[PDB]
Design a protein around this ligand. Structure first.
Ligand SMILES: [Zn+2]
Length: 654
């Protein structure tokens, strides 16, 4: 890895990398049948993926962290050129022919398991790209893919470019903080301008006690680009269905799910239906609580009470439930979670769980002075497992959300020796200063624990092929290991290891810990039922022929969530995931979370949350394979059976 590359070197490095890499593909793509071999074909492609991946990451990473705008821009441009190149190589028919020939020449069961898996994946990826099909079919696929890309760009752009706003008086905005107010564009009419952007939308629906104001904003927000985007959505659905058939599948969902743990649309439907049925009674209880809060508040404020929970009441009363029903003094809690302490305790927990020791590399080279490099070594032999950087504080130009970026993949080099994985964890926790400690909210501690889990997956994986390194697993399983790990921030012992009053050094009071842990369940029934509605709409649009998005969403909202969609709106027309690469996979969020609880409850809760023996089995069964083993097989080995929804429901008190 190199971090001192200028904007010009990035530009130069990109052209060179592409030319050198393309060279290997050209060589593989022009081999005569007779010269096709495992070493000249499979190994050649596997080897170049290793050299290319390392270099590519060095070129596209700076855009997310470099303090230099010139470097960030060149990195972004390189990323685009490299991404185009990746697609270009994946569509190479000449190269695919040699891979198909190799598959023919390779004797049955002659290859090592991961090598066989790699070959099968290459064959599969080409077929999913339609390279084995007739020219007329491929031409149609190409034409449809082009239209789909443009439609998706417009769907998102329409939403992002929208500048709709609603004018409200200080009274109509009752409930909103002072800091919030004033920050609004005061109109020459006196009224304040409220936009539909998230920074304005969410706080308003959660804090504004004026019902008519919440109603107007909800209607507007869920009606953005209604006409144009509903039209684009209808075309996306039809075109995706046609492309999927041309590629050999009865529905787009089935095409998409072939590569996921869920495998088929049927499996997903049953999953969502059963989950909805099981959560129904919890939803009924939560709605009864919210309706009572609304009745009481309307009576208190002298407002009319319609006896029904409206879409614009949800976020408001769910927040009230959390504040008045669970009562967690977050301001007090924060004082026990200074970032330095959380970092130390968090690293300590992962060390013990995985049998590792982290070593700070003082003075190591980094893209920013606040960045810290650590070497993870085996706790008994001291042998290096991998390396990771921690870039935790905000700064101009830096990626705004917490994330794990794989930099160097753990895999085998051309000579057979293993190269260690190197990853970087990025977060944006306030940096501690002179007399201003950085106290973390519990959600930040949760995010921290979650993200570092991915770092450990990156480093502990021992795949031999780059394609299967680290977090390169099924999309509906990649989040499962980290969500399983989030459970630690809801357990007393682990929390105590990551906390300490920043000033007095006192431990978090057990009474406070109890309430905190209990607050985890707040509004969970309705939160999940809504996610199910979204997952079902996504599946319906990608399995149904002529289902109407708005109508399907409305029907599901009433039957599952118990809260009606506002007439005249069209939430699906604003549903960005439908045009952001999550098409047919939205259920993945619930899928990973549900099964992550089985992983946690079945093994860690029964054998010891801080037991290193269970931790080593987790490292061995779940992390070590990387993507060299199907998720279903890793889970079956870790759980001793196939996963179930039982643990998740039990955690909800069902
Ligand atoms: Zn994650």
């Amino acid at each position: 890895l190199r971090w001192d590359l200028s904007a010009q070197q990035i530009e130069e490095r990109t052209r060179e990398l592409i030319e050198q890499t393309k060279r290997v593909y050209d060589q593989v793509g022009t081999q005569e049948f007779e010269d096709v071999s495992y070493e000249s074909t499979l190994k050649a492609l596997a080897d170049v993926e290793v050299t290319y991946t390392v270099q590519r990451n060095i070129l596209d990473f700076p855009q997310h962290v470099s303090p230099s705008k010139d470097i960030r821009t060149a990195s972004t441009e390189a990323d685009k050129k490299l991404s185009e190149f990746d697609v270009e190589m994946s569509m190479r028919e000449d190269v695919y022919q040699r891979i198909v020939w190799l598959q023919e020449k390779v004797q049955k069961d002659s290859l090592r398991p991961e090598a066989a898996r790699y070959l099968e994946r290459l064959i599969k990826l080409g077929r999913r790209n339609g390279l084995h099909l007739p020219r007329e079919t491929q031409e149609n696929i190409k034409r449809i893919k082009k239209k789909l890309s443009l439609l998706c760009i417009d769907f998102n752009k329409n939403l992002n470019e929208d500048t709709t706003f609603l004018p409200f008086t200080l009274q109509e905005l009752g409930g909103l903080p002072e800091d919030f107010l004033n920050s609004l564009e005061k109109m020459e009419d006196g009224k304040l301008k409220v936009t539909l952007k998230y920074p304005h939308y969410f706080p308003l629906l959660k804090k504004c006690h004026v019902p008519e104001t919440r109603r107007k904003v909800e209607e507007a927000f869920n009606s953005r680009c209604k006409e144009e985007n509903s039209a684009i959505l209808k075309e996306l659905v039809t075109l995706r269905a046609q492309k999927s058939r041309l590629l050999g599948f009865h529905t787009h969902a089935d095409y998409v799910l072939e590569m996921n743990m869920a495998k088929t649309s049927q499996t997903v439907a049953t999953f969502l239906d059963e989950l909805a049925q099981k959560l129904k009674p919890l939803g009924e209880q939560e709605r009864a609580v919210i309706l009572e809060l609304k009745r009481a508040e309307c009576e208190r404020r002298g407002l009319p009470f319609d006896g029904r929970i409206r879409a614009w009441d949800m976020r408001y009363y769910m927040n009230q439930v959390e504040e008045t029903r669970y009562c967690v003094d977050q301001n007090l809690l924060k004082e026990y979670f200074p970032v330095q302490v959380v970092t130390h305790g968090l690293l300590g927990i992962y060390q013990e769980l995985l049998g590792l020791a982290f070593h700070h590399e003082e003075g190591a080279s980094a893209w920013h002075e606040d960045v810290r490099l650590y070497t993870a070594r085996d706790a008994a032999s001291g042998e290096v497992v991998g390396k990771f950087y921690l870039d935790l504080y905000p700064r101009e130009g830096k990626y705004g959300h917490a994330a794990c970026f794989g930099l160097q993949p753990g895999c085998l080099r051309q000579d057979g020796s293993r190269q260690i994985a190197i990853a970087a964890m990025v977060a944006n926790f306030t940096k501690p200063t002179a007399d201003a400690p950085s106290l973390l909210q519990h959600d930040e501690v949760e995010t921290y624990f979650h993200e570092f889990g991915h770092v450990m997956h990156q480093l502990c994986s021992q795949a031999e092929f780059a394609m299967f390194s680290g977090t390169h697993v099924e999309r509906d399983f990649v989040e499962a290991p980290s969500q399983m790990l989030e459970n630690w921030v809801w357990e007393q012992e682990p929390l105590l290891r990551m906390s300490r009053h920043y000033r007095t050094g006192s431990a978090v009071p057990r009474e406070l810990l109890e309430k905190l842990i209990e607050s985890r369940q707040a509004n969970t029934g309705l939160f999940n039922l809504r996610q199910i509605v979204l997952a079902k709409v996504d599946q319906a649009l990608h399995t149904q022929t002529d289902a109407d998005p708005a109508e399907e969403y409305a029907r599901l909202c009433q039957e599952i969530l118990g809260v009606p969609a506002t007439p005249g709106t069209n939430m699906p027309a604003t549903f960005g995931h439908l045009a952001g690469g999550y098409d047919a996979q939205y259920y993945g969020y619930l899928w990973s979370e549900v099964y992550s609880m089985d992983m946690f409850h079945t093994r860690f809760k029964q054998e010891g949350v801080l037991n290193s023996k269970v931790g080593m089995d987790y490292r061995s069964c779940i992390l070590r394979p990387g993507g060299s083993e199907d998720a279903s097989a890793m889970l079956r080995r870790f759980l001793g059976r196939d996963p179930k929804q039982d643990a998740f429901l039990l955690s909800k008190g069902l």
